[PDB]
Design a protein around this ligand. Structure first.
Ligand SMILES: Nc1ncnc2c1ncn2[C@@H]1O[C@H](COP(=O)(O)OP(=O)(O)O)[C@@H](O)[C@H]1O
Ligand SMILES: Nc1ncnc2c1ncn2[C@@H]1O[C@H](COP(=O)(O)OP(=O)(O)O)[C@@H](O)[C@H]1O
Lengths: 371, 52, 371, 185
């Protein structure tokens, strides 16, 4: 037989067998339900909808979002999603493979315990594992040491990994991910005051986040150009309906990462967090990390982040020593790709959970057995 | 949300934990590795006692 | 006239005349500033805030913490604090008394030199002294020999003192104090995953550290009870808002002192450090210290430390010889109390710095003249 | 779109403003929705008789009290934002932890909708639902709320600091409308 991996890194959800280059297909983890009396009697009433099916159907559906802050909000909804994904995309039965789970690090045990409990009981599945993002990120990026930044749909990360080991004290974990940024966007957008608030309306922004964003090289200087020029300003359509045209409101958005005033918090930002977390970690290693600096997924997609990051580190580093960062093309997929690699090696046969343990001891097994 | 999130999160996140942490296994191993006074002084007393 | 002593042992800050039993009042050495546009125009804008005033005002203020690792971070802020303390609590003018300063031992000269420089220049004050914690600890505890452990807000100490003399080689000095422990606490707390990070949020923990902590008698056995029972688990409110209820997460915290893995370092811990530092010191004295063993301040407040400490020493000591420890009630105040005693004796009139020397020679004077 | 149930029916702007009077006179806040429906089945005291501003007498049932519930449930003209109260507690839970008690104490309402008798009570009922009951709750419902803003403006006008603060013609000469957005909130 053969081995199968779910990505539940948030945003669209990624699933695929070991050794395929890329997951078969991918789904937002939107969940949505009707909003109005069902008045075509000819229609079959289905009360819950998920995935691109919903993405089409959206308008009378209204959304629930089953993961806040990387924490999965409502289990039975997940179970709906999960079941759908297996049967509809995968045409797969729980017995068929070991299955591998993808976790925010340093987050409450409950997600571990219920996830495993459900999936061994509700699904019945040969072998289970839950793995921390950064490990995959290294394996895919193939440098045994490193530090990773990956700010997905969900909670945003700093982990230094040294070759072959964790520094769990070193690690920083942040709820700054693009969704909340986007919801700040609206509080921007009312300046131009084309204005709409609901969940689907919020996801419409996601497209603009694809298309229209780019990273500020320098904030002051950008403001000076903002006074000078309109090339900074670009014209974009409603997905249907109007043309819309957007100024500094594009570039201002990512700066939140550097300055989370605009929705206001203190953690001194991605880069200062990173250098802080470095200065926690010990002295000699540091050069390697100055060399090996790695980024991935949802926010990183933006053009230019790596450059201003390097500018920031050149601010904070003693300039004397080499600095560079890695910005691979495929970052948003990176995790599941690494998961595939993770699946490949026979050592997990030593390492998987088996049904037997789940019989003989509880969810408690995990927290010893896995990281 | 006050119904939707809270119904699960207040109810279940009430009870969060039980384990004899593997991380604590790490701690135990490290402390064993770094009880200098235990290993070194046991070894030295053991050897040095024998004088011929 | 009369003589006045500042405690700048970190945490709340303690100040009082010679011969009063306890300082008049005490202040955290928090410093904090605004975070948001000031939008009541009626309000007077003050840009910096300190003390219980801030402790009330906190929410829009954000904190700076002017002492790291017992090293005072930013001088002018200190000067703000210091000025406030004199005028607001003390109603005192710098001329009025000799003033006595309270120092982490074995730490960089700079704190000496600038502290004296400022306080003779910025304040103008009849006589100055800076004194090492352990001396006061003995005087208050009234045993001329000893060893002291006092792990305050700030850097954590071992000093054997023999009667009438220092053994500066003997001494051990550690950045393990309760603040950093508390910040580890959050990385615990996300297991239950009620989770918040900012400075004020971090200080909220301090209350729990008052209320909810107690010392592990035995770690394995405690885990066994943890599996058995919930009496180990207690229920506590937010300072306002929710009830919160906490498991082993309480007792696990102090163990860090015994095992600084959990935020990971090597120094083999309080007790092994102590016995190490003993075995440095010479052979005959040791019995006295086995008898005379003394502890104070922030961490020691916890119920039970002395007991497991004794358990540890009975591990490491040859059991043949007497062992005991002292655990006075008043330890957290102990230092300033001892300072009062220190102030009392006329010999400091021989011993104080005077303005004249500061005229005729620099800050350099101190480092000969004081310990 | 309610009123056509009784089906005395007119649509134009002035006709719409005629309703405003009824909103003055005839409205009152639902204490409990289910229980009110039960009383609606029981009683006609819930129902009151009112004239056209000129012309007919008109007499109105639950159609009065049903109206404010929209604030609590904006289905009836349908939207999602979970309503005044749930919005409020949401926006609280955004804001940070320690302050909250004060706001639980200090809760303030004004103007057009608030005029209705009873809002504060059901609001408090709602907060007692959503709050941990353990902590004090109250709301303020001053008499003068509809005027409140201009009154406060008068106070705002009074203090000399705006002399520091006003825009002057000079700036408008020397820089554009742009001045405002820095200068004011
Ligand atoms: N074309 C794009 N440009 C920029 N950001 C995008 C694009 N497509 C998706 N994203 C963002 O990337 C994230 C996708 O989820 P993901 O990065 O997988 O999160 P997680 O790390 O939780 O798995 C979301 O924040 C989404 O809005
Ligand atoms: N009730 C309490 N229980 C336990 N610890 C406390 C309590 N109150 C304060 N502390 C801790 O004791 C320390 C107070 O500062 P202090 O001991 O004076 O430090 P220093 O030795 O630098 O003067 C801080 O670490 C504070 O968190």
């Amino acid at each position: 037989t053969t081995a199968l991996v779910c990505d539940n890194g948030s945003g669209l959800v990624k699933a695929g067998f070991a050794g395929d280059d890329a997951p078969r297909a991918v789904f937002p983890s939107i969940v949505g339900r009707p909003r109005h009396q069902g008045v075509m009697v000819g229609m079959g009433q289905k009360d819950s909808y998920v995935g691109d099916e919903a993405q089409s159907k959206r308008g009378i559906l209204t959304l629930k979002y089953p993961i806040e802050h990387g924490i999965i909000t409502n289990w039975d909804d997940m179970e709906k999603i999960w079941h759908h994904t297996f049967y509809n995309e995968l045409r797969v039965a729980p017995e068929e493979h070991p299955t591998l789970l993808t976790e925010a690090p340093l987050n409450p045990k409950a997600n571990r315990e219920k996830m495993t409990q459900i999936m061994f009981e509700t699904f019945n599945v040969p072998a289970m594992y839950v793995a921390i993002q950064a490990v995959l990120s290294l394996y895919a990026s193939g440098r045994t040491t490193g530090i990773v930044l990956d700010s997905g749909d969900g909670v945003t990360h700093n982990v230094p990994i040294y070759e072959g080991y964790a520094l769990p004290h070193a690690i920083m974990r942040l709820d700054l991910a693009g969704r909340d940024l986007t919801d700040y966007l609206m509080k921007i957008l009312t300046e131009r005051g084309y204005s709409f608030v609901t969940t689907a309306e919020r996801e419409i922004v996601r497209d603009i986040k694809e298309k229209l964003c780019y990273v500020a090289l320098d904030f002051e200087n950008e403001m000076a150009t903002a006074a000078s020029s309109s090339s900074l300003e670009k014209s974009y359509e409603l997905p249907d309906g109007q043309v819309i045209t957007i100024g500094n409101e594009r570039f201002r958005c990512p700066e939140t990462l550097f300055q989370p005033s605009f929705i206001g918090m203190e953690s001194a930002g991605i880069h200062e967090t990173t250098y802080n977390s470095i200065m926690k970690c010990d002295i000699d290693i540091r050069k390697d990390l100055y060399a090996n600096n790695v980024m991935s997924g949802g926010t990183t997609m933006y053009p230019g982040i790596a450059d201003r990051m390097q500018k920031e580190i050149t601010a904070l580093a003693p300039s004397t020593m080499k600095i560079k960062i890695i910005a691979p093309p495929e970052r948003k997929y990176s995790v599941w790709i690494g998961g595939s690699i993770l699946a490949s090696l026979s050592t997990f046969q030593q390492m998987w959970i088996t049904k037997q343990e789940y019989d003989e001891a509880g969810p408690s097994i995990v927290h010893r057995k896995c990281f | 949300x006050x119904x939707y999130x809270x119904x699960x999160x207040x109810x279940x996140x009430x009870x969060x934990x039980x384990x004899x942490x593997x991380x604590x296994x790490x701690x135990x191993x490290x402390x064993x590795x770094x009880x200098x006074x235990x290993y070194x002084x046991x070894x030295x007393x053991x050897x040095x006692x024998x004088x011929x």
